[PDB]
Amino acid sequence: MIREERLLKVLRAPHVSEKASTAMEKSNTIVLKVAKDATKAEIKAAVQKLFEVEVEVVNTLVVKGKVKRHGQRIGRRSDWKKAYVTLKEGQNL
Amino acid sequence: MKRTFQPSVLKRNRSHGFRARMATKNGRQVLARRRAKGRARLTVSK
Amino acid sequence: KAKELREKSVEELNTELLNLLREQFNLRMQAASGQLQQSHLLKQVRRDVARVKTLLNEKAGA
Amino acid sequence: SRVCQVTGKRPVTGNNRSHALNATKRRFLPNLHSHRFWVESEKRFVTLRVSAKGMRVIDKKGIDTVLAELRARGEKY
Amino acid sequence: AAKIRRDDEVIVLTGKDKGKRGKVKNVLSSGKVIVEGINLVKKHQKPVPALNQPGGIVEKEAAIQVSNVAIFNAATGKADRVGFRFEDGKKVRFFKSNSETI
Amino acid sequence: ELDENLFLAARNLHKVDVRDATGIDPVSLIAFDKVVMTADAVKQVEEMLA
RNA sequence: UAAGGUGAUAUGAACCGUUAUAACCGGCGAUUUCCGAAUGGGGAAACCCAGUGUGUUUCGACACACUAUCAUUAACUGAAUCCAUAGGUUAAUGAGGCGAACCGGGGGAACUGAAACAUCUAAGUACCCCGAGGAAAAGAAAUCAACCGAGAUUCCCCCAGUAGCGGCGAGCGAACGGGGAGCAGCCCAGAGCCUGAAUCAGUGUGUGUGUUAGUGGAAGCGUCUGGAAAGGCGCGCGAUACAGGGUGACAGCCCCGUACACAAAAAUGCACAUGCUGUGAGCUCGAUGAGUAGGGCGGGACACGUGGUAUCCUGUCUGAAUAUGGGGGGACCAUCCUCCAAGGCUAAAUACUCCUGACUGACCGAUAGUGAACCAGUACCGUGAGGGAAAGGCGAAAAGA
Ligand SMILES: [K+]
Ligand SMILES: [K+]
Ligand SMILES: [K+]
Ligand SMILES: [K+]
Ligand SMILES: [K+]
Ligand SMILES: [K+]
Ligand SMILES: [K+]
Ligand SMILES: [K+]
Ligand SMILES: [K+]
Ligand SMILES: [K+]
Ligand SMILES: [Mg+2]
Ligand SMILES: [Mg+2]
Ligand SMILES: [Mg+2]
Ligand SMILES: [Mg+2]
Ligand SMILES: [Mg+2]
Ligand SMILES: [Mg+2]
Ligand SMILES: [Mg+2]
Ligand SMILES: [Mg+2]
Ligand SMILES: [Mg+2]
Ligand SMILES: [Mg+2]
Ligand SMILES: [Mg+2]
Ligand SMILES: [Mg+2]
Ligand SMILES: [Mg+2]
Ligand SMILES: [Mg+2]
Ligand SMILES: [Mg+2]
Ligand SMILES: [Mg+2]
Ligand SMILES: [Mg+2]
Ligand SMILES: [Mg+2]
Ligand SMILES: [Mg+2]
Question: Which residues in C lie closer than 8 A to residue A50 (C-beta atoms)?
Fold first, then answer.
């Protein structure tokens, strides 16, 4: 069993975009920003515990951060992990 | 025409990378010199 | 808030810790969605966790 | 290394000198030999890498006395 | 401790508003103070469309150096210097001129 | 003898300098408008310069 | 310690606080991802892959802790081989890496000079390597001296560019002795006695006194010019404070300071006082460093290039006497004088500054001064080692139109 302490840290934010929206209303899939070191197993456990929904499967990818200038002052944004969480049919969030 | 620089990341790391430098006392002296000078980049290691 | 926490036992503190972590999670979701006006709460809870963890470490004897 | 285990004799540097006194660097090596020494006390042979001089020392002081000095300096054999 | 505090009645020692009295609204970390109605500037404020747009020529107080104001001793009716002393364990400010606690 | 009171009283007066007879120097003697010597100091300076 | 504040860019957003859990500063703690000696194995640094043991389990899994090498010591075990030894396993303790200079040791150039060049010089320098410390090294006479004496080592000033050495060229270059800084002597090669007594050391407790936050800290107005006064003029005042910085112009008295006087819950340095444990001093009787000194051969270090050449070190081959003895006094012998090798330890005066604080400059002031006043060892260049810039100033205030 994954500690609840751990599960409470792994989900960071919902991800809002046209693709995320289409994923929700076509494939019953929610898109999350999750902790960089979160595994598919942890992500599944967290969503089922914290959002109280049945998860079919988690797909994940690492987004590489862009380089961005800030008044002639350059800096690289952090890489972050995105999770496409497919909910079982009948579940809603 | 074929120029002298033909990049291979594997070859780069094996020739000049951090672990190659640490492998010998002369390599470790390179790192000491570069730290002393205050280089932002000690080696080719990415 | 260190005084009143120091009275509580290890088990009570462990319970307090989970509560704070759940609050932290809830605030983080609110903040992400853009339904948190009181942004200062995020720091408050974060420092509260640190405080509890400190006291737990003291009562362990470390 | 070319070091006598008894005496500590090792290569020392110096010069060759020609008739015209041209100096070229050289080494002087010790006259080292591996020799099996009968240790009567331990009923066995011990091999040491020793100079001929070291062998004269062992004759004089006895192997037991010399082996004690080796053990004191922490030199294995 | 600071000799000039927020809410102190002060008189201006130097500058265009020399002589004028006022109350200290803010004390900045830079070592400057905003004094009510004193060191006024005419800001040419642009309209900001994001929020309400009161774009005009606004008159606001500019900070003055704290060493350019003096605590106003209403008894003497003059600028005064401040000292510190302990009364009942607590550090207090007093007017140098008449030695009265502020 | 360097009176400690006199030394402390003269410290903050920039035009005034207070020395003992042993501690006189050529530049000081010329630099100041007037030189005041105590009778004692005069005796000591005499002895110092034979 | 406090009426403000949550580091800056940086504007605002949400807030915290105002007489004491706001903040800020100091002491002691806690936390401290991954890489890196990197140490569980591996590896293209910041990653990949484990084992063991404890738990926990919703049987999906989870957490935590151990697990490098080498040295030393101990225990257990254990070949050929009968004992044994080698080897093996476990435990305990320690080490490794980094660092500007200074220090000791192992190696060790060449350009150059000699108006060529080989002896010689440069120079035991540069450089490489090993080791160590706050300093290191050296050190308590087998030393000098000169028939009088001195009395370990180190450093400074002389002696002296002398005596010497030297293709007697170029060059190299002492000591004796004097003046100073500083000063300190000990122990083993062994038993008895003494008894835990000199003494230092460890660990407590005191008392002073530093350091690591702080507190108080004097005295100015009028008038003229000016955008502004701190300037001019007038009349005052403080000064153990007229160092310095700031403030709308160049201010003792506006602000911060300064002289001066105070301050520590906590940790900590140093000097004394004193418990405790270890320590053997002192006395007596002995002992008195052998493959050593010396020698032959080959080199090296001594100012000294082997020379008439003492003394020192030793790669090689040899080889005494041992206090009735031995070393040295510049070939060597005799006499005399002086010292006692072949075991070791030792403060101070000396060297240096990556770093911290304070203060100073007939030092620089943006092509100068650091390469770098500025987000510079950066941009950029190079496979890499490595090379390596340019670039400061609106205003008093953004009042930035
Ligand atoms: K004076
Ligand atoms: K590691
Ligand atoms: K040469
Ligand atoms: K020449
Ligand atoms: K030539
Ligand atoms: K005036
Ligand atoms: K002022
Ligand atoms: K001016
Ligand atoms: K001033
Ligand atoms: K010999
Ligand atoms: Mg799938
Ligand atoms: Mg994938
Ligand atoms: Mg980043
Ligand atoms: Mg490894
Ligand atoms: Mg590892
Ligand atoms: Mg492997
Ligand atoms: Mg020449
Ligand atoms: Mg040390
Ligand atoms: Mg020493
Ligand atoms: Mg004060
Ligand atoms: Mg004052
Ligand atoms: Mg001006
Ligand atoms: Mg001799
Ligand atoms: Mg000899
Ligand atoms: Mg001879
Ligand atoms: Mg010889
Ligand atoms: Mg002789
Ligand atoms: Mg210029
Ligand atoms: Mg420059």
Answer: 25
Instruction: Specify the 3-state DSSP secondary structure of A27.
Output: helix
Is the Cβ–Cβ distance between A82 and A32 less than 8 Å? yes
- Check: CB of residue E11 under 8 Å from CB of residue E17: no
Alpha carbon distance B31, D1 (integer Å): 31
- AA letter at C14: N
What one-character DSSP code corresponds to residue C22?
A: H
Domain, as residue range, for D70 = 1-77
SS3 call for A84 = strand
Report yes or no on chains A and C touching (3+ CB pairs under 8 A): yes
Method by which the model was determined:
cryo-EM
Which residues on C lie below 8 Å from A45 (Cβ)?
none
Which residue reads 């570069």 in tokens?
B34
| Interior/surface letters F2-21, b for 16+ CB within 10 angstroms, e for the rest | eeeeeeeeeeeeeeeeebeb
C32–A13 CB contact, under 8 Å:
yes
- The DSSP bridge pattern shows strands E78-80 and E69-73 to be antiparallel
Contact assessment for residue E80 and residue E12, using Cβ atoms and an 8 Å cutoff: no
Q: Which domains are seen in chain A, by residue range?
A: 1-93 (3.30.70.330)
E7: Cβ contacts below 8 Å, ≥ 6 apart? E23, E24
Per-domain residue ranges of chain C: 1-62
Resolution of this model in Å is 2.0
